[PDB]
Protein backbone atom coordinates (compact mmCIF):
# COMPACT_ATOMS: atom_id res chain seq x y z
CA UNK A 1 0.00 0.00 0.00
CA UNK A 2 1.74 3.22 -1.23
CA UNK A 3 -0.45 5.87 0.55
CA UNK A 4 -0.28 3.83 3.71
CA UNK A 5 3.50 4.23 3.60
CA UNK A 6 3.23 7.88 2.55
CA UNK A 7 0.89 8.84 5.42
CA UNK A 8 3.01 7.04 7.99
CA UNK A 9 6.28 8.63 6.76
CA UNK A 10 4.66 12.08 6.62
CA UNK A 11 3.43 11.66 10.19
CA UNK A 12 6.81 10.43 11.38
CA UNK A 13 8.79 13.10 9.53
CA UNK A 14 6.52 15.85 10.75
CA UNK A 15 6.89 14.69 14.36
CA UNK A 16 10.69 14.58 13.95
CA UNK A 17 10.64 18.13 12.54
CA UNK A 18 8.52 19.40 15.47
CA UNK A 19 10.82 17.83 18.04
CA UNK A 20 12.74 20.30 20.22
CA UNK A 21 16.15 18.89 19.06
CA UNK A 22 15.37 19.08 15.33
CA UNK A 23 16.40 22.71 14.91
CA UNK A 24 19.98 22.01 13.72
CA UNK A 25 18.69 19.72 10.94
CA UNK A 26 15.82 21.71 9.50
CA UNK A 27 17.60 23.17 6.49
CA UNK A 28 20.64 22.65 4.30
CA UNK A 29 23.70 23.71 6.28
CA UNK A 30 25.07 27.02 4.94
CA UNK A 31 28.73 27.30 3.99
CA UNK A 32 28.79 30.67 5.81
CA UNK A 33 27.96 29.01 9.15
CA UNK A 34 29.94 25.71 8.71
CA UNK A 35 33.64 26.10 7.72
CA UNK A 36 34.60 23.67 4.89
CA UNK A 37 31.44 21.61 5.46
CA UNK A 38 30.92 20.73 1.79
CA UNK A 39 34.55 19.57 1.46
CA UNK A 40 34.00 16.97 4.25
CA UNK A 41 30.38 15.96 3.69
CA UNK A 42 29.70 14.59 0.19
CA UNK A 43 26.08 13.54 0.75
CA UNK A 44 24.45 16.46 2.65
CA UNK A 45 20.91 15.92 3.98
CA UNK A 46 18.32 17.79 5.99
CA UNK A 47 14.67 17.66 6.99
CA UNK A 48 13.54 20.27 4.46
CA UNK A 49 15.08 18.24 1.66
CA UNK A 50 13.49 15.11 3.13
CA UNK A 51 10.07 16.85 3.15
CA UNK A 52 10.51 17.62 -0.55
CA UNK A 53 11.62 14.11 -1.41
CA UNK A 54 8.57 12.84 0.45
CA UNK A 55 6.27 15.25 -1.44
CA UNK A 56 8.05 14.19 -4.64
CA UNK A 57 7.09 10.52 -3.95
CA UNK A 58 10.70 9.45 -3.60
CA UNK A 59 10.22 7.41 -0.40
CA UNK A 60 8.71 4.25 -1.94
CA UNK A 61 10.30 2.12 0.83
CA UNK A 62 11.12 2.39 4.58
CA UNK A 63 14.77 1.67 3.68
CA UNK A 64 15.12 4.87 1.57
CA UNK A 65 13.53 7.08 4.23
CA UNK A 66 15.71 5.57 6.95
CA UNK A 67 18.81 6.03 4.82
CA UNK A 68 18.27 9.79 4.37
CA UNK A 69 17.37 10.32 8.00
CA UNK A 70 20.41 8.31 9.20
CA UNK A 71 22.52 10.38 6.79
CA UNK A 72 21.35 13.51 8.60
CA UNK A 73 22.72 12.04 11.83
CA UNK A 74 25.97 10.58 10.44
CA UNK A 75 26.84 13.83 8.63
CA UNK A 76 26.41 15.64 11.94
CA UNK A 77 28.49 13.20 13.97
CA UNK A 78 31.20 13.10 11.25
CA UNK A 79 31.55 16.89 11.20
CA UNK A 80 30.97 17.96 14.85
CA UNK A 81 32.71 17.27 18.21
CA UNK A 82 31.12 14.50 20.39
CA UNK A 83 30.13 16.89 23.22
CA UNK A 84 28.87 19.65 20.86
CA UNK A 85 25.21 20.67 21.12
CA UNK A 86 24.65 19.49 17.54
CA UNK A 87 26.06 15.99 18.24
CA UNK A 88 23.87 15.70 21.40
CA UNK A 89 20.79 16.82 19.39
CA UNK A 90 21.56 14.20 16.72
CA UNK A 91 21.39 11.36 19.28
CA UNK A 92 18.34 12.69 21.16
CA UNK A 93 16.52 13.04 17.85
CA UNK A 94 17.68 9.66 16.65
CA UNK A 95 16.31 8.02 19.82
CA UNK A 96 13.01 9.79 19.26
CA UNK A 97 13.01 8.77 15.62
CA UNK A 98 13.48 5.07 16.41
CA UNK A 99 10.71 5.14 19.05
CA UNK A 100 8.32 6.55 16.43
CA UNK A 101 9.30 3.92 13.81
CA UNK A 102 8.79 1.12 16.33
CA UNK A 103 5.40 2.68 17.23
CA UNK A 104 4.33 2.58 13.58
CA UNK A 105 5.58 -0.99 13.01
CA UNK A 106 7.57 0.09 9.95
CA UNK A 107 9.06 -3.21 8.62
CA UNK B 1 47.59 -0.51 1.31
CA UNK B 2 49.44 -1.69 4.48
CA UNK B 3 49.27 1.88 5.77
CA UNK B 4 45.47 1.58 5.63
CA UNK B 5 45.54 -1.97 7.00
CA UNK B 6 47.69 -1.04 10.02
CA UNK B 7 45.53 2.00 10.84
CA UNK B 8 42.29 0.02 10.60
CA UNK B 9 43.71 -2.82 12.67
CA UNK B 10 44.76 -0.32 15.35
CA UNK B 11 41.37 1.40 15.33
CA UNK B 12 39.40 -1.85 15.33
CA UNK B 13 41.48 -3.25 18.13
CA UNK B 14 40.95 -0.16 20.25
CA UNK B 15 37.23 -0.35 19.63
CA UNK B 16 37.18 -4.06 20.61
CA UNK B 17 39.13 -3.31 23.84
CA UNK B 18 36.76 -0.50 24.82
CA UNK B 19 34.67 -1.21 27.92
CA UNK B 20 31.37 -0.73 25.97
CA UNK B 21 32.30 -3.09 23.10
CA UNK B 22 31.02 -6.25 24.84
CA UNK B 23 27.54 -6.29 23.21
CA UNK B 24 29.07 -6.07 19.74
CA UNK B 25 31.81 -8.65 19.94
CA UNK B 26 29.93 -11.50 18.22
CA UNK B 27 27.00 -12.19 15.87
CA UNK B 28 23.69 -11.76 17.70
CA UNK B 29 21.97 -15.16 18.11
CA UNK B 30 18.33 -15.64 17.00
CA UNK B 31 17.78 -17.57 20.27
CA UNK B 32 18.63 -14.47 22.39
CA UNK B 33 17.06 -11.75 20.12
CA UNK B 34 13.38 -12.39 19.15
CA UNK B 35 12.78 -11.79 15.41
CA UNK B 36 16.13 -9.96 15.08
CA UNK B 37 16.89 -11.29 11.57
CA UNK B 38 13.42 -10.22 10.34
CA UNK B 39 14.16 -6.58 11.33
CA UNK B 40 17.89 -6.36 10.65
CA UNK B 41 18.81 -7.36 7.08
CA UNK B 42 22.54 -6.51 7.28
CA UNK B 43 23.75 -7.84 10.66
CA UNK B 44 27.33 -6.92 11.72
CA UNK B 45 29.73 -7.41 14.63
CA UNK B 46 33.35 -6.88 15.62
CA UNK B 47 34.36 -10.53 15.22
CA UNK B 48 33.06 -10.49 11.64
CA UNK B 49 34.81 -7.14 11.08
CA UNK B 50 38.09 -8.65 12.35
CA UNK B 51 37.70 -11.46 9.80
CA UNK B 52 36.91 -9.10 6.96
CA UNK B 53 39.98 -7.08 7.91
CA UNK B 54 42.21 -10.17 7.98
CA UNK B 55 40.61 -11.18 4.69
CA UNK B 56 41.78 -7.87 3.12
CA UNK B 57 38.21 -6.75 2.50
CA UNK B 58 38.73 -3.21 3.87
CA UNK B 59 40.51 -1.67 0.84
CA UNK B 60 38.97 1.75 1.68
CA UNK B 61 38.04 3.80 4.75
CA UNK B 62 34.46 3.97 3.43
CA UNK B 63 33.94 0.17 3.62
CA UNK B 64 35.30 -0.05 7.15
CA UNK B 65 33.18 2.92 8.32
CA UNK B 66 30.11 1.44 6.73
CA UNK B 67 30.38 -1.89 8.62
CA UNK B 68 31.20 -0.23 11.92
CA UNK B 69 28.38 2.27 11.51
CA UNK B 70 26.10 -0.67 10.73
CA UNK B 71 26.96 -2.26 14.05
CA UNK B 72 25.58 0.80 15.84
CA UNK B 73 22.56 1.46 13.66
CA UNK B 74 21.46 -2.20 13.89
CA UNK B 75 21.62 -1.96 17.69
CA UNK B 76 19.71 1.34 17.93
CA UNK B 77 17.10 0.24 15.50
CA UNK B 78 16.39 -2.99 17.40
CA UNK B 79 16.79 -2.00 21.10
CA UNK B 80 14.94 0.51 23.43
CA UNK B 81 16.61 3.95 23.76
CA UNK B 82 17.40 3.57 27.48
CA UNK B 83 18.55 -0.08 27.16
CA UNK B 84 22.13 -0.87 28.17
CA UNK B 85 22.88 -1.95 24.58
CA UNK B 86 21.65 1.36 23.11
CA UNK B 87 23.74 3.35 25.63
CA UNK B 88 26.84 1.22 24.78
CA UNK B 89 26.26 1.78 21.07
CA UNK B 90 26.47 5.59 21.50
CA UNK B 91 29.38 5.58 23.90
CA UNK B 92 31.28 3.30 21.52
CA UNK B 93 30.27 5.30 18.48
CA UNK B 94 31.56 8.50 20.10
CA UNK B 95 34.83 6.71 20.85
CA UNK B 96 35.00 5.38 17.33
CA UNK B 97 34.55 8.83 15.68
CA UNK B 98 37.22 10.32 17.95
CA UNK B 99 39.67 7.60 16.85
CA UNK B 100 38.97 7.98 13.08
CA UNK B 101 39.37 11.77 13.34
CA UNK B 102 42.66 11.16 15.27
CA UNK B 103 43.98 9.01 12.40
CA UNK B 104 42.81 11.42 9.64
CA UNK B 105 40.58 8.83 7.89
CA UNK B 106 37.31 10.88 8.10
C1 LIG C 1 23.74 19.81 11.41
N1 LIG C 1 24.32 21.14 11.61
C2 LIG C 1 25.66 21.26 11.62
O1 LIG C 1 26.39 20.28 11.51
C3 LIG C 1 26.22 22.56 11.79
C4 LIG C 1 27.53 22.62 12.32
C5 LIG C 1 28.22 23.81 12.54
O2 LIG C 1 29.48 23.71 13.08
C6 LIG C 1 30.45 24.76 12.91
C7 LIG C 1 31.83 24.26 13.40
O3 LIG C 1 32.79 25.02 13.45
N2 LIG C 1 31.85 22.95 13.73
C8 LIG C 1 32.98 22.37 14.14
C9 LIG C 1 33.51 22.64 15.41
C10 LIG C 1 34.68 22.00 15.83
C11 LIG C 1 35.32 21.08 14.98
C12 LIG C 1 34.80 20.80 13.72
C13 LIG C 1 33.63 21.44 13.31
C14 LIG C 1 27.59 25.02 12.24
C15 LIG C 1 26.29 25.01 11.70
C16 LIG C 1 25.59 23.80 11.49
O4 LIG C 1 24.31 23.79 10.94
C17 LIG C 1 23.08 24.29 11.65
C18 LIG C 1 21.98 24.54 10.59
C19 LIG C 1 20.85 25.34 11.16
O5 LIG C 1 20.95 25.36 12.59
C20 LIG C 1 22.06 26.13 13.00
C21 LIG C 1 23.34 25.55 12.45
C1 LIG D 1 24.22 -5.89 19.80
N1 LIG D 1 23.47 -6.91 20.58
C2 LIG D 1 22.11 -6.89 20.55
O1 LIG D 1 21.48 -6.06 19.88
C3 LIG D 1 21.42 -7.90 21.29
C4 LIG D 1 20.02 -7.77 21.48
C5 LIG D 1 19.27 -8.71 22.20
O2 LIG D 1 17.92 -8.55 22.35
C6 LIG D 1 17.49 -8.55 23.71
C7 LIG D 1 16.09 -7.94 23.76
O3 LIG D 1 15.14 -8.61 24.17
N2 LIG D 1 16.02 -6.66 23.31
C8 LIG D 1 14.84 -6.03 23.30
C9 LIG D 1 14.37 -5.39 24.45
C10 LIG D 1 13.13 -4.74 24.42
C11 LIG D 1 12.37 -4.72 23.25
C12 LIG D 1 12.84 -5.36 22.09
C13 LIG D 1 14.07 -6.02 22.12
C14 LIG D 1 19.91 -9.83 22.73
C15 LIG D 1 21.27 -10.00 22.57
C16 LIG D 1 22.04 -9.06 21.85
O4 LIG D 1 23.40 -9.20 21.66
C17 LIG D 1 24.18 -10.11 22.49
C18 LIG D 1 24.33 -9.55 23.93
C19 LIG D 1 25.74 -9.29 24.17
O5 LIG D 1 26.46 -10.51 24.08
C20 LIG D 1 26.58 -11.02 22.73
C21 LIG D 1 25.52 -10.41 21.77
Swiss-Prot record, chain A:
Family designation: Belongs to the acetyltransferase family. GCN5 subfamily.
Domain comment in the entry: (Microbial infection) The bromodomain mediates binding to HIV-1 Tat.
Residues of the full protein shown: 724 to 830 of 832
Subunit structure: Interacts with SIRT1. Interacts (unsumoylated form) with NR2C1; the interaction promotes transactivation activity. Interacts with EP300, CREBBP and DDX17. Interacts with NCOA1 and NCOA3. Component of a large chromatin remodeling complex, at least composed of MYSM1, KAT2B/PCAF, RBM10 and KIF11/TRIP5. Interacts with NR2C2 (hypophosphorylated and unsumoylated form); the interaction promotes the transactivation activity of NR2C2. Interacts with KLF1; the interaction does not acetylate KLF1 and there is no enhancement of its transactivational activity. Interacts with NFE4. Interacts with MECOM. (Microbial infection) Interacts with and acetylates HIV-1 Tat.
Name the UniProt record assigns to this protein: Histone acetyltransferase KAT2B
Native organism taxonomy: Eukaryota, Metazoa, Chordata, Craniata, Vertebrata
Location in or out of the cell: Nucleus; Cytoplasm, Cytoskeleton, Microtubule organizing center, Centrosome; Cytoplasm
Coiled-coil segments: none
Illness the protein is tied to: Defects in KAT2B has been found in a patient with isolated coloboma, a defect of the eye characterized by the absence of ocular structures due to abnormal morphogenesis of the optic cup and stalk, and the fusion of the fetal fissure (optic fissure). Isolated colobomas may be associated with an abnormally small eye (microphthalmia) or small cornea.
Bromo domain residues: 1-104
Described purpose of this protein according to its UniProt entry: Functions as a histone acetyltransferase (HAT) to promote transcriptional activation. Has significant histone acetyltransferase activity with core histones (H3 and H4), and also with nucleosome core particles. Has a a strong preference for acetylation of H3 at 'Lys-9' (H3K9ac). Also acetylates non-histone proteins, such as ACLY, MAPRE1/EB1, PLK4, RRP9/U3-55K and TBX5. Inhibits cell-cycle progression and counteracts the mitogenic activity of the adenoviral oncoprotein E1A.
Annotated organism of origin: Homo sapiens
Effect of substituting residue 86 to A: Complete loss of acetyl-lysine binding
Domain of life: Eukaryota
Tissues where this protein is expressed: Ubiquitously expressed but most abundant in heart and skeletal muscle. Also expressed in the skin, in keratinocytes (at protein level).
Amino acid sequence: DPDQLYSTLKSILQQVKSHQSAWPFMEPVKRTEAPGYYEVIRFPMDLKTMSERLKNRYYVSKKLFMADLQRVFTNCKEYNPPESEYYKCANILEKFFFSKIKEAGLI
